[PDB]
Amino acid sequence: NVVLVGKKPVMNYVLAALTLLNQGVSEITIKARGRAISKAVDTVEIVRNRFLPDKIEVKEIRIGSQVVSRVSTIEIGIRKK
Amino acid sequence: ATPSNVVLVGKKPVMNYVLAALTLLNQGVSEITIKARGRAISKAVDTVEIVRNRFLPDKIEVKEIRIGSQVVTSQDGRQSRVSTIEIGIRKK
Ligand SMILES: [K+]
Ligand SMILES: [K+]
Ligand SMILES: [K+]
Ligand SMILES: [K+]
Ligand SMILES: [K+]
């Protein structure tokens, strides 16, 4: 129950997240690395503020690194209220 | 974090903000906040990760991360929304 945010338009990942939520998945994690990290935050904010206002909480946010080169990563856990 | 102890990460090279963060930490500031908006959000994460992987491994804790949105006015007068991140870090 993970949406990996990559290079595609942000609405791709917004719709992927809503699809899971509408399937009865109440907790999903949005993940990204490198420059896509800002698009992962966009994805969550669009889902939280524009689609499901007052029904999505941000449960936790983790940042880290991975070797490839070091690249940064983010993981954002969201939950239905 | 008092207002002097926020590093607002923007358009400059990432080592500029790494240097700002290390300077505050070296001066004894216990708590700092790394903030950014829009595409600089990924550079803000980079800043924290470079600090704690390349310079001060095992000395920096991430106290809390908050994300949100801001309303930005462009030069032509339109308003749109930009994402935000705030990363509180502290030593020990
Ligand atoms: K990207
Ligand atoms: K130091
Ligand atoms: K930038
Ligand atoms: K503005
Ligand atoms: K403009």
CA dist A66 → A19, A38, A70, B71, B73 (Å)? 29, 17, 6, 33, 36
Tell me the pairing of strands B6-9 and B60-73: unpaired
CA torsion sign for B1, B39, A40, B68 is: positive
Q: Which residues pair with A58 in a beta bridge?
A: A78
Q: Does A3 touch chain B (CB under 8 A)?
A: no
Q: Which backbone phi and psi does B68 adopt, to 5 degrees?
A: -165, -160
Domain locations along chain A: 2-80
* C-beta atoms of A45 and B65 within 8 A: no
CA dist B78 → A10, B5, B38, B71, B72 (Å)? 21, 32, 16, 10, 8
Around Cβ B46, how many Cβ atoms within 10 Å?
26
| Mutation site for B-interface testing, chosen from A37, A51, A67 by largest number of B Cβ within 10 Å | A37
Entry field: residues in chain B: 92
Surface-to-core class of residue A23, CB atoms within 10 Å of its CB (0-12 exposed, 13-18 middle, 19+ buried): exposed
Of A37, A64, A70, the CB nearest to B41: A37
Distance CA(A75)–CA(A6), nearest Å, equals 13
Which CATH homologous superfamily contains domain A2-80?
Alba-like domain (3.30.110.20)
DSSP character for A76? E
Q: By the 8 A CB rule, do B5 and B24 touch?
A: yes
Q: Does B8 touch chain A (CB under 8 A)?
A: no
Q: Does B81 touch chain A (CB under 8 A)?
A: yes
Q: Is A54 helix (H, G, I), strand (E, B) or coil?
A: coil
Distance CA(B56)–CA(B46), nearest Å, equals 14
What secondary structure does DSSP assign to chain B, as a single string?
--GGGEEEE-SS-HHHHHHHHHHHHHTT--EEEEEEETTHHHHHHHHHHHIIIII-TTSEEEEEEEEEEEEEE-TTS-EEEEEEEEEEEEE-
Residue bearing tokens 């990563």? A73
* C-beta atoms of B62 and A58 within 8 A: no
Distance CA(B41)–CA(A37), nearest Å, equals 7
Of A45, A64, A72, the CB nearest to B42: A72
Around Cβ B74, how many Cβ atoms within 10 Å?
8
User: Solved how?
Assistant: X-ray
Class of domain B3-91: alpha beta
* Closest by CA position to A78, among listed A7, A18, A34: A18
Q: Which backbone phi and psi does B34 adopt, to 5 degrees?
A: -100, 115
Q: Is A70 helix (H, G, I), strand (E, B) or coil?
A: strand
Of A34, A49, A72, the CB nearest to B69: A49
Distance CA(A57)–CA(A77), nearest Å, equals 9
